[PDB]
């Protein structure tokens, strides 16, 4: 029973592998890029099954020209005892062999086998460093990604910094797009994993992210640069970038990525004085994970110092587990700024003594200093009057008849005309 169903699943997975190989072969036909991402898109689906039988069948099936590069995976490859070339000795395309080696890499990655995984990944990316074909650039992106992933659970992410830097440059000269973006994101993750935020920031300023990058890669890059600018006091742009990242993240999957981005967005918005909307704290897939961040947010809204301290004491482990402890401390000292933002949002004119009384600041001069500091930033638009005690807010002129809507709607033109231009450029009529 189980053996029969397992065999059918293995056969259908092998058929999908055959189809992917044929698609990669067709990609070089016509001398055009793409048609490889079609095979690479179902990569998680194929990766899910990856039985030993199907992997061995594929290895024996597409490698009629036996060389040593396969004679390394064979020692770890286990064949069925009692239990197909799709068919001459035509030499293998580099993309095809890279693909099959990549699924080997993924299987050995899944089964917690890491050291020989490091070896096979090393032998995989050693060869592709010699090629100069754009068809092998799309596959190279995933190759590097799972190479870094292999080195991650091997706890040697620091070693690969040189290799990723070299491949990133190589992609930069060859005007690579997918490989360049994947390498840049891997480099950013490497820098962050060892808290080298200054190095990551310096790298970001000197490297331009390709606009034609994939949605997932764009989201990852946005999250990484948002974390950079958030731990680098550029809170407003960090929040903007994090929201942009959440927009481009996959909707169905990517639970962990969305959880991390939501946690950081909560902390950044709280630091900015704004209040995150309660809606995100309610989705199932996000609720419990954000539960520690929820009890925190309430305190920020109330300014209850004791509640903040208790939440920190009972959830510091979780906060450090996702690396939000330091930002949370900065928030613990910016709760007052949040309160001042709320006060100035509600009131138009208000005496400083009222500020001190409402915020429990225990001093009118201290409230004066705090509101002056907050209004120095873009936190509050006001105009303090020390002669009397006002915190008079700026007059709200009619935004219409003010050239501001013209500017916004001009940006929206630029965007929509740009979208139309790319859409009409990417029509790609066929030859026959």
């Amino acid at each position: 029973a189980a053996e029969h169903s397992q065999r059918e699943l293995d056969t259908v997975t092998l058929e999908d592998i055959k189809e992917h190989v044929k698609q990669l072969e067709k990609a070089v036909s016509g001398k055009e890029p793409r048609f490889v991402l079609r095979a690479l898109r179902m990569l998680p689906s194929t990766s899910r099954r990856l039985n030993h039988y199907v992997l061995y069948k594929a290895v024996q099936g597409f490698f009629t020209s036996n060389n040593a590069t396969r004679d390394f995976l064979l020692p770890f490859l286990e064949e069925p005892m009692d239990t197909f070339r799709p068919a001459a000795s035509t030499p293998l395309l580099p993309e095809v062999e890279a693909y099959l080696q990549l699924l080997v890499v993924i299987f050995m990655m899944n089964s917690k086998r890491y050291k020989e995984a490091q070896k096979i990944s090393d032998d995989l990316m050693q060869k592709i460093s010699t090629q100069n074909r754009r068809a092998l650039d799309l596959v190279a992106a995933k190759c590097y990604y799972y190479h870094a992933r292999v080195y991650e659970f091997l706890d040697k992410l620091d070693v690969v910094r040189s290799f990723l830097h070299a491949r990133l440059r190589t992609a930069t000269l060859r005007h690579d797009a997918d490989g360049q973006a994947t390498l840049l994101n891997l480099l950013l993750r490497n820098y962050l994993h060892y808290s080298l935020y200054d190095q990551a920031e310096k790298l970001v300023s000197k490297s331009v992210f390709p606009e034609q990058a994939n949605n997932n890669e764009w989201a990852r890059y946005l999250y990484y640069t948002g974390r950079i600018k958030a731990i680098q006091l550029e809170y407003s742009e960090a929040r903007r970038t994090m929201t942009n990242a959440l927009r481009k993240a996959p909707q169905h999957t990517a639970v962990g990525f969305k959880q991390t981005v939501h946690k950081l967005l909560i902390v950044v918005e709280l630091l900015l004085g704004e209040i995150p909307d309660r809606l995100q704290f309610r989705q199932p897939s996000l609720k419990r994970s954000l539960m520690p961040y929820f009890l925190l947010t309430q305190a920020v809204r109330t300014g209850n110092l004791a509640k903040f301290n208790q939440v920190l004491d009972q959830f510091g482990e979780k906060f450090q587990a996702d690396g939000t402890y330091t930002l949370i401390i900065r928030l613990r000292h910016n709760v007052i700024k949040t309160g001042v933002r709320m006060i100035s949002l509600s009131y138009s004119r208000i005496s400083l003594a009222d500020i001190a009384q409402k915020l429990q600041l225990d001093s009118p001069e201290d409230a004066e200093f705090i509101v002056a500091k907050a209004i120095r930033d873009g936190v509050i638009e006001a105009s303090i009057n020390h002669e009397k005690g006002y915190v008079q807010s700026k007059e709200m002129i009619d935004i219409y008849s003010t050239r501001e809507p013209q500017l916004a709607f001009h940006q929206r033109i630029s965007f929509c005309l740009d979208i139309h231009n790319m859409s009409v450029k990417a029509m790609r009529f066929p030859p026959k």
Binding site: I231, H333, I336, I370, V371, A374, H386, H410, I413, L417
Partner: protein
Amino acid sequence: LILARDILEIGAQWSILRKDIPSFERYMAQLKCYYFDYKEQLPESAYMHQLLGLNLLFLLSQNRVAEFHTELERLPAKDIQTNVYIKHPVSLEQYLMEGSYNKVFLAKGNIPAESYTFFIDILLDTIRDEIAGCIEKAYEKILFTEATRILFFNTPKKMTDYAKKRGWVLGPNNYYTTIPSTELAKQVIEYARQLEMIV
């Protein structure tokens, strides 16, 4: 490596002792190159955290809060609230962040070591000039006496000299649009272009 680390530590402490800023940066920079990454073999130095907090306070001194927080990220989280040597500069940074300047002035005397006063003084000046900047970007017309009181310029002549130091001036009574049609015409013509000229 241990002896090189000792050399650089003595160099940095001499640099602060010399009372010179630019050399101090280079000495601590090389020491950071020798401090805490990939080393894993050097014994825990007794001067580790003293100079770590030294560097943090220095970064605070010249308005380098971003670098201050990055270097905070570099060092372990356990010592941030435990080691006094870095507890101090972090504390003044937080008080500066809130705006409790008087708290910073009070805590200027709570240094964990004598090898802190050097840029403690320049940070006491930095908070005052930041106060002045936030004041000018906050108030409308602040009277001279209040500025003298809250700028911590105890000597009124000192306050006046600092007023002359900045373009922010005393004033007489001691109380310190058009339709462009050019660029947006270009924008409209750009829209016209993007409509025409084929794909």
